[PDB]
Design a protein around this ligand. Structure first.
Ligand SMILES: Nc1nc2c(ncn2[C@@H]2O[C@H](COP(=O)(O)OP(=O)(O)OP(O)(O)=S)[C@@H](O)[C@H]2O)c(=O)[nH]1
Lengths: 305, 293
């Protein structure tokens, strides 16, 4: 029985976590960490830690990653005591600001020192947010990559090539929330709510330990050929950056109702094998989600390029 | 007065987190108080009462001494006060003895709970973990000490940390449930205060079993628990609680009570009772608190 903790750090990471809780992600503990007390009062997370209170006064790191790093580092004994006991820790954030960029690698190092399987799931900021945010994100992601077993990086620019062409700014960030949720859930649900093909904590640990930098694809479909269509959308996802063909490690999850049959699961698995690198290690798992109706949802995590 | 007022104080990050765990598990019958002692960080809490007085012990001490009047008003009216800094050190280990000394000067039966870290955790300067224990011991009636090393005789690294949190919770719940939650055998609060006032250091033992002979079996595990450090023979004050379902029988109960008397020192005071927790199914859980020598 694996204990899984999902940490959101900074405003975007805390909003993603609220989204995960709102959509009913189960079997995990939710921890919100931020440098803004008011923002934390609105969070529904199980654990809420306000950090950098004297350096920031509950107003955020003002986009300075050094302030975020030092806020997390000063609270490190306390974060450690919140994490101890976890088998698996997710660290989620929008890279580019001060709190998430700076604090995420601290939270991840602590998880990794404890020997929890440590997965980062972060976005790169949209190009329209400016060169400073993109540059801070890039350094934040390099730092985090040193501290995580696997680091899933979602390029927010690619999200604009999905969903609706007439989205607002608020919509774009809700979509970033959703994808961070998809990243976490596509993995955690293999463990907490397996279907016919059970990929347990040990299997996940074996493919994700020390895997390095990763990308994700997602796909969903209904009606005839839903499994094949969902997998083909996930494999060709703009978030995966056309790089599925080069990944050496691939974890795939297919979610559907109680009645998702082996035939459908296997058809999706077969399309994914064919698209993969010839020497790829691919693990295929299933998820029971009875709220899905006639839809199935495929998530692909690709690493080892 | 007649429903004993019990206040459980978590202080510092490990203490507030312990209290938040107690709330999450539905520990009943007590009032929870979360005291944050760090200037730079605040762990939030759903405790009834919260005080933010904000990793050095001296820092926590000074912060709580500064807030001594408001802590006093939070504690006034309690018959019993538990204080803990929970797992890991920090400012809470400095604040805990201050809250304890205020509880005790008010007349409340003051019970500290403190953990000794696992040895593989290493050690911070100035012997600060033992200084915390010594200072907390000076200001409590009873100090329950949980030696985390002993858990490894009861294991993976994650299991070790999890068992530590679980036994810490039990350090409070085994006693509070005995007092606050009816069972077939109930106790007098005066007798609790009789064994625990001025008693000094105590240790705890736990045991669980199912099926035939469950009560005897869980009691036997509890009495021989590595966490008791074989202090059962010499102990002058013993509390034993047996938690189980409604159908817990008087005969099996009494067999457990008889075992504890036999195992304990001839001159021991023994307080014994049961707790009805209908969520345990066919399982029985025993807590033994051994105090004195
Ligand atoms: N997923 C998600 N991402 C967001 C949201 N708001 C902003 N972002 C993204 O996250 C990045 C970091 O912003 P944010 O998380 O708010 O900063 P912070 O880490 O809290 O940093 P600060 O203390 O300096 S204000 C932004 O550059 C943007 O790309 C949100 O609501 N949800």
């Amino acid at each position: 029985l694996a204990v899984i903790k999902v940490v959101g750090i900074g405003g975007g990471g805390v909003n993603a976590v609220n989204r995960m809780i709102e959509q009913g992600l189960k079997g995990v503990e939710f921890i919100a960490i931020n440098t803004d007390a008011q923002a934390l009062l609105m969070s529904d997370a199980d654990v809420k830690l306000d950090v950098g209170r004297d350096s920031t006064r509950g107003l955020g790191a003002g986009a300075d990653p050094e302030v975020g790093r030092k806020a997390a580092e000063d609270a490190k004994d306390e974060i450690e005591e919140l994490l101890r006991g976890a088998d698996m820790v997710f660290v989620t954030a929008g890279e580019g600001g001060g709190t998430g960029t700076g604090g995420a690698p601290v939270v991840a190092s602590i998880a990794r020192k404890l020997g929890a399987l440590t997965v980062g799931v972060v976005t790169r900021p949209f190009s329209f947010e400016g060169k400073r945010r993109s540059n801070q994100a890039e350094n934040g992601i390099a730092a985090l990559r040193e501290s995580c077993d696997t680091l899933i990086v979602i390029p927010n620019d690619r999200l604009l090539q999905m969903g609706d062409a007439a989205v607002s700014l608020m919509d774009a960030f809700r979509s970033a929330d959703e994808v961070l949720l998809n990243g976490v859930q596509g993995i955690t649900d293999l463990i907490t709510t397996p279907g016919l093909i059970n990929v347990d904590f040990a299997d996940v640990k074996g493919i994700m330990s020390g895997a390095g930098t990763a990308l994700m694809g997602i796909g969903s479909a209904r009606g005839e050929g839903r499994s094949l269509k969902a997998a083909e959308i996930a494999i060709n996802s703009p978030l995966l950056e056309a790089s599925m063909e080069g990944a050496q490690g691939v974890l795939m999850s297919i979610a559907g109702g109680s009645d998702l049959g082996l035939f459908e699961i296997n058809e999706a698995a077969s399309l994914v094998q064919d698209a993969a690198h010839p020497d790829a290690n691919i693990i295929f798992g299933t998820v029971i989600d009875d709220s899905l109706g006639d839809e199935v949802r495929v998530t692909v995590i690709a690493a080892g390029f």
